[PDB]
Amino acid sequence: EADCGLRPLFEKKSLEDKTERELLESYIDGR
Amino acid sequence: DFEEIPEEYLQ
Amino acid sequence: IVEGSDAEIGMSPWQVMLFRKSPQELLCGASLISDRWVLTAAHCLLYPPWDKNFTENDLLVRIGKHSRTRYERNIEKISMLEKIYIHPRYNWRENLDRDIALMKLKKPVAFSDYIHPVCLPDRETAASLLQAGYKGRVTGWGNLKETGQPSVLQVVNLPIVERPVCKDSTRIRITDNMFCAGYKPDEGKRGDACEGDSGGPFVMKSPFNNRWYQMGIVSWGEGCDRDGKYGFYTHVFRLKKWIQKVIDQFG
């Protein structure tokens, strides 16, 4: 879907869940 | 220990 | 999920519960990839060593759930299966190679705050994110310990492990259609999938476009959360050509 992977209660309202930052901090590629 | 689901789904 | 935590509401809106009709019980996890298609592990549906061979009418899929056992009125949606598709080269005899299956629903499920599909990776997203040390997220209603069961959906974030370390941890023959994840004994964090979490998603949030991608399917392990053991996941991108072939032919 064009809208896949975007959560109504998080990405769609620009709210972060409590641990997604842990994932981001592990992603070195491309920063 | 599961709550019964509506009968329509088991039809 | 061992050594995880309670999910937040709407944290994993692609989560699917595969539910056995009789006896009423959790069969496996799964994930929503469109309004008509659910992805799971083949061994959730077919595993002859354990006399497991489910047909469509044996099962329901329950979407939008948080509580394990409650009927979540006005929130969850319960769908019937039209057809099961198991990978034609799923190796249940040896090592669960190509542990992947699709289910087409009889009717489209309505999206909501609690129900929304995950993306499947492209080659570039897979190449970028499937790297040792990069963390993904595993969710499920499976056992809390190897040797009880959760009130609500559990979540744990785990790092992908170097392939030689995966190989050296096990006597099972690993293939390119698998990857493994988990902390090492030294690392001082733990966590794992366990029985009942099979078929659920290992997801990663792309830092390029801020979308969640399903990179893996909970497949197998030796125990749960054992030091020096790792969880093994079906490599979704490596099997995507099959996924697309099924959906193009039958969708």
Ligand SMILES: N[C@@H](C(=O)N1CCC[C@H]1C(=O)NCc1ccncc1)C(c1ccccc1)c1ccccc1
């Ligand atoms: N423990 C076995 C396993 O995971 N098997 C058996 C068939 C189904 C799946 C399962 O329960 N998957 C769910 C799972 C279990 C533990 N953590 C995470 C998910 C495994 C094995 C791998 C591949 C093929 C056969 C068996 C195993 C590994 C080493 C020694 C013996 C068995």
Ligand SMILES: *[C@@H]1O[C@H](CO)[C@@H](O)[C@H](O)[C@H]1NC(C)=O
């Ligand atoms: C699984 O069950 C189906 C349904 O009858 C059957 O056609 C198939 O041969 C079975 N496969 C195995 C490996 O038992």
Ligand code: NA
């Ligand atoms: Na080995």
Ligand code: NA
């Ligand atoms: Na471990």
